[PDB]
Amino acid sequence: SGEPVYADAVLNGWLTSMGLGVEYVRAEGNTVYYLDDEGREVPVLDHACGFGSLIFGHNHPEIIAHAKAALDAGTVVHAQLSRQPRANQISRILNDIMRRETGRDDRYNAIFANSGAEANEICMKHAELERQERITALFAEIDAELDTAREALTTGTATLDTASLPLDVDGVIADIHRHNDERRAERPLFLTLDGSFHGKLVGSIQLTQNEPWRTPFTALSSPARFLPADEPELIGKIVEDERRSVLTLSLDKDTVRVVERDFPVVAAIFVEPVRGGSGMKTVTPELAEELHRLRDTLGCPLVVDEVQTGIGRTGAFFGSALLGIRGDYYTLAKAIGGGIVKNSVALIRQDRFLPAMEVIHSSTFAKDGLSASIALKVLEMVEADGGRVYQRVRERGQRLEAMLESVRADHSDVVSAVWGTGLMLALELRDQSNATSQAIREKAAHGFLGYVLAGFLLREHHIRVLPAGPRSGFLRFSPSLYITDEEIDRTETALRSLFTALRDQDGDRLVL
Amino acid sequence: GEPVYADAVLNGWLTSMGLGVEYVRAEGNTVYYLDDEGREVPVLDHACGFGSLIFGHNHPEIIAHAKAALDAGTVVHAQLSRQPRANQISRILNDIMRRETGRDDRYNAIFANSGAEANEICMKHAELERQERITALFAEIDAELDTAREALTTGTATLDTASLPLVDVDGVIADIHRHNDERRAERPLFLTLDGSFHGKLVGSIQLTQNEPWRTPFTALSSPARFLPADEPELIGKIVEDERRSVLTLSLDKDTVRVVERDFPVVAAIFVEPVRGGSGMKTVTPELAEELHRLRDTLGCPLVVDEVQTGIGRTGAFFGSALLGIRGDYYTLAKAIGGGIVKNSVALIRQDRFLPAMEVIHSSTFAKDGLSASIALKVLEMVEADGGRVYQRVRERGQRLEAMLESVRADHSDVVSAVWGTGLMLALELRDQSNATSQAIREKAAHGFLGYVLAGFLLREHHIRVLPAGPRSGFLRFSPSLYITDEEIDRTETALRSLFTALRDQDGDRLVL
Numbered sequence A: 001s002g003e004p005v006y007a008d009a010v011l012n013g014w015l016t017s018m019g020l021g022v023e024y025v026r027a028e029g030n031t032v033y034y035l036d037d038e039g040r041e042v043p044v045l046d047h048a049c050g051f052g053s054l055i056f057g058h059n060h061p062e063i064i065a066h067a068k069a070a071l072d073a074g075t076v077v078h079a080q081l082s083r084q085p086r087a088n089q090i091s092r093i094l095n096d097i098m099r100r101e102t103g104r105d106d107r108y109n110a111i112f113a114n115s116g117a118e119a120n121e122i123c124m125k126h127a128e129l130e131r132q133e134r135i136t137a138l139f140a141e142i143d144a145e146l147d148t149a150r151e152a153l154t155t156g157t158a159t160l161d162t163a164s165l166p167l168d169v170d171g172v173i174a175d176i177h178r179h180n181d182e183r184r185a186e187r188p189l190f191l192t193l194d195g196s197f198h199g200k201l202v203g204s205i206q207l208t209q210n211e212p213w214r215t216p217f218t219a220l221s222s223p224a225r226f227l228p229a230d231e232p233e234l235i236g237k238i239v240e241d242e243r244r245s246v247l248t249l250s251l252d253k254d255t256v257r258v259v260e261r262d263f264p265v266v267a268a269i270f271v272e273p274v275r276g277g278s279g280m281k282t283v284t285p286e287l288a289e290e291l292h293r294l295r296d297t298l299g300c301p302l303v304v305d306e307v308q309t310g311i312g313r314t315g316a317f318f319g320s321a322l323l324g325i326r327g328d329y330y331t332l333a334k335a336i337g338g339g340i341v342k343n344s345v346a347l348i349r350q351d352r353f354l355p356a357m358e359v360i361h362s363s364t365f366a367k368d369g370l371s372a373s374i375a376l377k378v379l380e381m382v383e384a385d386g387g388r389v390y391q392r393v394r395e396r397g398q399r400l401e402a403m404l405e406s407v408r409a410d411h412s413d414v415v416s417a418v419w420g421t422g423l424m425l426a427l428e429l430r431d432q433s434n435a436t437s438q439a440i441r442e443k444a445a446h447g448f449l450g451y452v453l454a455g456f457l458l459r460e461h462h463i464r465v466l467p468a469g470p471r472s473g474f475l476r477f478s479p480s481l482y483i484t485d486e487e488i489d490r491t492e493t494a495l496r497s498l499f500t501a502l503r504d505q506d507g508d509r510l511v512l
Numbered sequence B: 001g002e003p004v005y006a007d008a009v010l011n012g013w014l015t016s017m018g019l020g021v022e023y024v025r026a027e028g029n030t031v032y033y034l035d036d037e038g039r040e041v042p043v044l045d046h047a048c049g050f051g052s053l054i055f056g057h058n059h060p061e062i063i064a065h066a067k068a069a070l071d072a073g074t075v076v077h078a079q080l081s082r083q084p085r086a087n088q089i090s091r092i093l094n095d096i097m098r099r100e101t102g103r104d105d106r107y108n109a110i111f112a113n114s115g116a117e118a119n120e121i122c123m124k125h126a127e128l129e130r131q132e133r134i135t136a137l138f139a140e141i142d143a144e145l146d147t148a149r150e151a152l153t154t155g156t157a158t159l160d161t162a163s164l165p166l167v168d169v170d171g172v173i174a175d176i177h178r179h180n181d182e183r184r185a186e187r188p189l190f191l192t193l194d195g196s197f198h199g200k201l202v203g204s205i206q207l208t209q210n211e212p213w214r215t216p217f218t219a220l221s222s223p224a225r226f227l228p229a230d231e232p233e234l235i236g237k238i239v240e241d242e243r244r245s246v247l248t249l250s251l252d253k254d255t256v257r258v259v260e261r262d263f264p265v266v267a268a269i270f271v272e273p274v275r276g277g278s279g280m281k282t283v284t285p286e287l288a289e290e291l292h293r294l295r296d297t298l299g300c301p302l303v304v305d306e307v308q309t310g311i312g313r314t315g316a317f318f319g320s321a322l323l324g325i326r327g328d329y330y331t332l333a334k335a336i337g338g339g340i341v342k343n344s345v346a347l348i349r350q351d352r353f354l355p356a357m358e359v360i361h362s363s364t365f366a367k368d369g370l371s372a373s374i375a376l377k378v379l380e381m382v383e384a385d386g387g388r389v390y391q392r393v394r395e396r397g398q399r400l401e402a403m404l405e406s407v408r409a410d411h412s413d414v415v416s417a418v419w420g421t422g423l424m425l426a427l428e429l430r431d432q433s434n435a436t437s438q439a440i441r442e443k444a445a446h447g448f449l450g451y452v453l454a455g456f457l458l459r460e461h462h463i464r465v466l467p468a469g470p471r472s473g474f475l476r477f478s479p480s481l482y483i484t485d486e487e488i489d490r491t492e493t494a495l496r497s498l499f500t501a502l503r504d505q506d507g508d509r510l511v512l
């Protein structure tokens, strides 16, 4: 209509036209409820689950009860600049878990924040502290090399070689200082994988491939180079083209030369163990070895974003441990809030950790007492009974993956693949840009196909699926570890129904 | 030398300042620590989450509403579904702003997880607006270049060679396109006030004056120019130096000239109504009028950061309404989570709001059901009983300000001023860098004075104060609206004690 609206007009307009215009009024385990026209609750199976936030489902009774107990105990939520031992206690548990799963006896400092993106930006900031340490060291050495060369050229023990000048003593040194100062002030680069998703704040958005989400904001912040994960022979040459030089004077016996030395341009490499923005593709061993090489070569940290793959989703606590990704920094977020509060953590290896970070970084809401308590509960639950929860994820993941595989095998004309691991899975949809049906074709063309297919699943089978990937070309399946055999069977029926409709090009049934 | 997993440096530093205490419980204006015998010691909290706790710690009505929302099975994670509570919150905030400003302006709401995230939504939207202006300018320049190319080939006009020092028809146009393309890719500027605090993420940190917090990160993101608030005759010339030009061809009858046109460099102006990082200084009417002039002149939005001054702190809902600051965008955070959860909102004027922002911006945890419910409760509480809560803040503020003034008047040798409004107040400490006492002098020299004085207040009067401002040169007083007459008297006694010890240069009593 034409009445005043104060939020979400465009978002709601667009959700309605996709068939996703529903208000969920209540949620319990793997079920969200909307009201029909008569005001009765209609149960919907949730495969989205806060984009993998709800490993234990919606409003887990043990988490709700813990939260209520912490509220009634008068938990100190706001205790800024006082002792909060729970931060140390959480970091200790995460350290013990990482040692168990990797067999490495490595120690990590924890910095807390309020979202996945804030945790990735603590890592970007710390990576840049490390880069400024390397730069200070390099520039101190260059000053000493310049002083030494200036001794040998004035004293008279050496001659300037004029073949090097395409890069008078005092004038050449001032031209070097100018060149070097320009280089020093240039923005660094981050390296990501193609399809990368690392958040949407001013810094983190540059690390997210999705072109409409990022390219309006290019001018604001340091960019990333999106390395091709599938073609990792081309990564070496792409990173090689980003080499940059500072100048110094090199004294060898009686000849002084202007020479190029390497400048640290790359602040950090980011990687998701399972690539959310890419349709849940797992990092292959070949790509892991290439990211290890780049980290060893450039001397910048490798940051492992486990915002989505952490707290058990993959069948281990850390998906990095499962896939052999050997990171310097790790980030966690989604499941650590128990599906009720907001919390995130950067783990930074203690032998790289710059203690200035503990006093120059802060946030009003970070390390709050309520999300600290709930974190310790979530970690108790995921660790309980000698790690049977991870075994439950692996066994539920296998059941759900096998079902999605059984559907692909009979629907390979519209389903190109199953991707992911544990309970972080996706179907890849074949391109429908040449679809017989105009309505399907137009939606594929605008990048809206997955959204439309999700509407079908909602209105005809009462199943909530959300798409992933850049043109909604993937369907996400990230339910809780309590997903039942009967819910997996109902999803199978729904998907055969959906993919039979798609084979038949039934635009009247699929598109509203 | 035992294994530590967080906060070693932060805790070491708090201990040496006299602030090494663990709060075990909190209620109203009181936090509790345990003495050596295990008894709870009540401490009066003047810090209150840096102005998060207008209603105090764990307000029974907020705790009860939170428990009710959890027991109702509120949907916390309902991403890409209808969430009418966002619209309902934005509507209440719109109604309140109309009442306090008399302006019938409408605002769209985008939610986030922290004060910094809300400021970065504003930075991102400001940059969308700047990219619209740029597209418009570049379209006009293409048309001007086509018209000038007609008149120079057709033969109706002559190129004036006096204008060529800004760069043959085709070659001059290619030199213009190159110049313009370089300009287009340059990072924008933000304008802030000196002492500004707008958060500490990759983008927002550039908007925060405090040099140790910001300067390590300079290379990452667009900078700000910190305008001098006190001397606003110099603002004009500082913004004037940041003028940048693109080139075009100007056809005037039969002469074509290369000319400079204005390029939109400034993405946004940020302002706090009460300047947190400046020791709680209120924006004066002269400075307000200068920020209005800059916004009208540059055509970028004025973003009013009410993360700290919002939700009633100043004796109105919006401190911008109280001080006559006419913003385009507003941010809120601290008190809106009820002292228990994390939430923030950007209000953007609907006649500037670019609907792409509703579908290209998102966050996992933003607009969650729990903080949405608690927001509506906090807004009900602050609006209740025909605005008597604002009256209570004004009346509590006057009582606390009068007390701080009565202390300054008798302790003007060590207290230089009282700043702020409502329940957002501070004492300015006189410089102690020339202090008789070595231990006081050394602490003043490291910028640690306010922290040390806060330790005295904790161990001797059981009062929690934290410093503000860049060299901890201010003491913050931002308690809840329930602060009692007796708590204000106990603070007076504590401060006379502290400032008599400081007058006497009693370093053995003040510094551990």
Ligand SMILES: Cc1ncc(COP(=O)(O)O)c(/C=N/[C@@H](CCCNC(=N)N)C(=O)O)c1O
Pocket: A051, A115, A116, A117, A118, A120, A197, A198, A199, A200, A272, A276, A277, A305, A306, A307, A308, A333, B362, B363, B364, B365
């Ligand atoms: C691997 C990774 N790193 C960072 C973040 C950011 O953390 P934050 O959101 O700030 O808490 C996330 C979130 N992943 C979900 C997010 C939903 C955002 N909205 C839409 N995608 N529509 C996803 O890929 O869809 C992440 O997965």
Ligand SMILES: Cc1ncc(COP(=O)(O)O)c(/C=N/[C@@H](CCCNC(=N)N)C(=O)O)c1O
Pocket: A362, A363, A364, A365, B050, B114, B115, B116, B117, B119, B197, B198, B199, B200, B272, B276, B277, B305, B306, B307, B308, B309, B333, B468
């Ligand atoms: C006006 C304004 N804009 C943004 C933020 C950041 O919002 P966020 O912290 O990200 O939620 C704040 C916080 N202001 C307080 C406390 C900061 C929290 N602790 C430190 N980081 N210092 C201050 O002046 O000390 C703000 O006041």
